[PDB]
Amino acid sequence: LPMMPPVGVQASILSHDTIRITWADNSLPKHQKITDSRYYTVRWKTNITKYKNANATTLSYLVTGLKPNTLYEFSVMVTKGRRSSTWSMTAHGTTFELVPTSPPKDVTVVSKEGKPKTIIVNWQPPSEANGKITGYIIYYSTDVNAEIHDWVIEPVVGNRLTHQIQELTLDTPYYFKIQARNSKGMGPMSEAVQFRTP
DSSP: OOOOOOEEEEEEEOSSSOEEEEEEOTTSOTTOOOOSSOEEEEEEEEOOOOOEEEEESSSEEEEOSOOTTOEEEEEEEEEETTEEOOOOOOEEEEOOOOOOOSOOEEEEEEEETTEEEEEEEEEEOOTTOOSOOOEEEEEEESOTTSOGGGSEEEEEESSOSEEEEOOOOTTOEEEEEEEEEETTEEOOOOOOEEEEOO
């Protein structure tokens, strides 16, 4: 005989890496207390992929170690002895964003053709964006050891991957670094790239 599958599965987002799953088992009384050896199995995955799973003898399961800003599909079944149920209807849960935790990648700086005091900076999004990138901030200086408040700031709006900087002094070594931004704040700076104006 088939067991009733769990119902009312819900995904409560607790952080950028934790989601608590809860459900009801209508084969139990309304007080929902378990007095037998049944156990539930919770499965989850990204719709980006195989399932991860875990068992529980509670009508809830805490899923930790997830990735930021990621949509997961969760479902639950029950087993007791040689009987079990089909999987429950799915519930979706998307983890919160987290500040980026890695830097913009492969930063390069070159001269703008025909405009020697102008340079073009190019880069790629950080691997650990951890949320929708909303912009970047480029910093540059003629002194690599200068404290950050002394570098010149060039904000870039949106998830653009290139930016031009004008009016630089000629025949001068400059250092450029960049950090990404999302709703949670600024990520780490890339390692400075040195470039000497022509």
